[PDB]
Amino acid sequence: PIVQNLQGQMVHQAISPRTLNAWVKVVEEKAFSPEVIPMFSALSEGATPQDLNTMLNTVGGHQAAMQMLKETINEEAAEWDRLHPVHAGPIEPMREPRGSDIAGTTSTLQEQIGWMTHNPPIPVGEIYKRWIILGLNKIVRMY
Amino acid sequence: IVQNLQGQMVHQAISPRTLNAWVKVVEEKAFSPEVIPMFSALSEGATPQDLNTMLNTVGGHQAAMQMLKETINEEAAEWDRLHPVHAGPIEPGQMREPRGSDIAGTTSTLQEQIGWMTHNPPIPVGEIYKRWIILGLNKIVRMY
Ligand SMILES: [Cl-]
Ligand SMILES: [Cl-]
């Protein structure tokens, strides 16, 4: 998540032991029944894309579902780009995120926090969560 | 955390998503042992106000919720006993020390709660109240 330090700067806060413990428990009991989704939504509150990837990579078992989820995320990232055209570089010299930045694969943790705390926010955590949930909805059909 | 109109990241109260998940946990698990890890994670970063919202969204379990209120009253009284204070801050505009009733959120405002939680060093009133609530839950789980 994101927290303010003693200097007043926004910086990363590691997913806590209590949050990761609960998410594992939810995965162990519910992955990937419909009931997993409200639990994921709450436990991922304030997550950066890097935190969201940590949560996804905690899922033990469910190899096939995790592959489908990844395919959905890849699709959404590419569509995001097509619906959010940008110039061939910052005119500057903050770049707009691409789909792969939103999914955490091409962006740094600092870029993620930059977007999420920009004025107005470019809510890359919330956007990635929407793609993840689209995927979870597809996967519930296997369960 | 949420961004205000001035572009600042400030505290925001317990969210609809968090509360919806908490309900669902109550509906399935209250107050079996497995409620406690879920309460602990869902209340991460909660103020005393957020924690009283969680407690007051439990439907039923009146016996349990009465035991919780007794546990909180006792821990608040013991907090006051074990944290002796002066009558008030010696310096004029200085932040007062929280008493038990401040930690339980009955005599403190949201502003004060956030003031303590973000002090340097923190006075983590949300964590303290959560400890009292979990102590109550560990008694109550014996009924379930
Ligand atoms: Cl976000
Ligand atoms: Cl706290």
Q: Does A2 touch chain B (CB under 8 A)?
A: yes
How remote is the CA of residue B107 from the centroid of ligand 1, in Å?
34
How far apart (Å, rounded) are the C-alpha atoms in residues B91 and B127? 27
Residues A143 and A32: beta-carbon distance below 8 Å: yes
Longest Cα–Cα distance of chain B, Å, equals 50
The answer for residues whose C-beta is within 8 angstroms of residue A7's C-beta and 6 or more apart is none
DSSP B1: -
Residue A51 CA: distances (Å) to CA of A43, A55, A129, B28, B128: 11, 6, 11, 27, 26
For chain A, how many residues are written? 143
Pairing of strands A10-12, B2-3: unpaired
Give which of B121, B129, B124 is closest to B49, Cα–Cα: B129
Phi, psi angle pair for A25, to nearest 5°: -65, -40
> What are residue B10's DSSP bridge partners?
B2
User: Which residue in A4, A21, A41 is closest to B9 by CB distance?
Assistant: A4
How remote is the CA of residue A130 from the centroid of ligand 1, in Å?
11
How far apart (Å, rounded) are the C-alpha atoms in residues B62 and B51? 17
In 3-state terms chain A splits into helix, strand, coil percentages (rounded to 5) of 60, 5, 40
Q: Does A117 touch chain B (CB under 8 A)?
A: yes
Give which of B58, B55, B52, B48 is closest to B11, Cα–Cα: B48
Give which of A115, A73, A75 is closest to A94, Cα–Cα: A115
Residue B78 CA: distances (Å) to CA of B73, B75, B81, B130: 9, 5, 5, 15
Residue B8 φ/ψ region, left for φ over 0, alpha for ψ in the -120 to 50 degree band, beta for the rest: beta
Domains of chain A: 1-143 (1.10.375.10)
Resolution (in Å) of the shown entry? 1.5
| Cβ contact B9–A10 (<8 Å) | yes
Q: Chain A to chain B, count of Cβ pairs less than 8 Å apart? A: 59
A-facing residues of B in 15-34 (CB < 8 A) are: 15, 17-18, 20-22, 24, 34
- Cis peptide leading into residue A32 (ω within 30°): yes
- Number of DSSP helices (H) and strands (E) in chain B, helices first: 7, 2
How far apart (Å, rounded) are the C-alpha atoms in residues A119 and A26? 34
On the CB side of B114, CA atoms within 13 Å amount to 10
A82 sits in which H/E element: helix A63-83
Distance from CA of B77 to the nearest CA of A (A): 28
Q: Does A3 touch chain B (CB under 8 A)?
A: yes
Pairing of strands A2-4, A10-12: antiparallel
CA angle, A35 then A41 then A44, to 5°: 130
| Cβ contact B41–A16 (<8 Å) | yes
